[PDB]
Amino acid sequence: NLYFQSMSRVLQAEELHEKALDPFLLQAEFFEIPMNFVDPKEYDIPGLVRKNRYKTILPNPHSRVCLTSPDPDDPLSSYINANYIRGYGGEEKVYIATQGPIVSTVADFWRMVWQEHTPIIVMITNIEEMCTEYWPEEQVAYDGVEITVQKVIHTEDYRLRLISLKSGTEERGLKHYWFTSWPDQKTPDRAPPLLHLVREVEEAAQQEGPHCAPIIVHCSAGIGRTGCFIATSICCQQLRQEGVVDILKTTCQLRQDRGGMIQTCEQYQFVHHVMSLYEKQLSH
Numbered sequence: 001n002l003y004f005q006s007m008s009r010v011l012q013a014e015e016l017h018e019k020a021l022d023p024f025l026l027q028a029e030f031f032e033i034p035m036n037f038v039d040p041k042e043y044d045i046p047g048l049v050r051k052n053r054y055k056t057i058l059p060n061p062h063s064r065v066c067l068t069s070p071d072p073d074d075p076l077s078s079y080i081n082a083n084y085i086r087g088y089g090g091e092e093k094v095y096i097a098t099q100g101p102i103v104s105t106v107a108d109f110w111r112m113v114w115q116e117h118t119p120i121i122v123m124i125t126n127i128e129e130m131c132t133e134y135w136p137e138e139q140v141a142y143d144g145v146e147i148t149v150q151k152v153i154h155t156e157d158y159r160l161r162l163i164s165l166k167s168g169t170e171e172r173g174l175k176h177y178w179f180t181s182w183p184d185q186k187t188p189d190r191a192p193p194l195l196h197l198v199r200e201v202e203e204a205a206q207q208e209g210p211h212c213a214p215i216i217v218h219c220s221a222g223i224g225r226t227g228c229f230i231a232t233s234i235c236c237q238q239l240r241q242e243g244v245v246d247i248l249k250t251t252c253q254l255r256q257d258r259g260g261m262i263q264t265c266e267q268y269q270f271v272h273h274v275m276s277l278y279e280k281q282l283s284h
């Protein structure tokens, strides 16, 4: 409740199923949630224009990812349009939501991957929408870190890249999930590929073992599709643990961390479609 009054609506199975199919109640609920957008005058940094895809979609200062190398005291070098996002039960830094890298922020994005020890990146972008292609065909170096694409795995809904990151003697692995099945119309029949991605990523996150480093999630602005992916991921754990889903409370938690998380009402309804489907799958 730090930045605005959180709201809650605890849904058991029947209400969840019915709520996903009630666009009139969904829009009434959705448009009562504060966007929690940052006033652009909150940042007064020369050269900042080149770091933002959109001038009104800025990272909330309290949860902003600061790039501490090579100069934490330089407001521009330290800047990236990204926020730490709490996971299920308020766990700190489960995710980082960021905008899709642009030409001038490609190297900044890799500085963030390196700083945070990110083991997983989730990219939600259509092949037609091509975010700047920030990974190499085979190999590239950015600020002392050699990035190598070791393997490309093509599945129906995502391209998985197994990437190696090397700097001096230390080597780290990274899994890059490029999801290509984001739908134009957020109808219930388009929910299974997103649910499959959510489940595949949470299993890969568990395989990292204790205190998994932040998972980076991005789409064009880093709020809409990113908000849907993260909200779904949190609610899948809530459903398995508690037997209920609270998409409203989860959306508020996301907005406190980054303004605008779950951008449209159609995206809000889509999360309900995904969660209603997962509840039916779990029931078996």
Ligand SMILES: O=P(O)(O)C(F)(F)c1cccc(-c2cccc(C3CCCCC3)c2O)c1
Pocket: 054, 056, 057, 183, 220, 221, 224, 225, 263, 264, 267
């Ligand atoms: O499901 P999707 O394709 O992502 C969608 F939500 F439908 C959708 C459709 C069309 C545009 C955007 C969008 C994406 C990034 C930034 C913005 C800005 C918001 C603030 C003002 C400037 C534009 C967008 O409007 C999202």
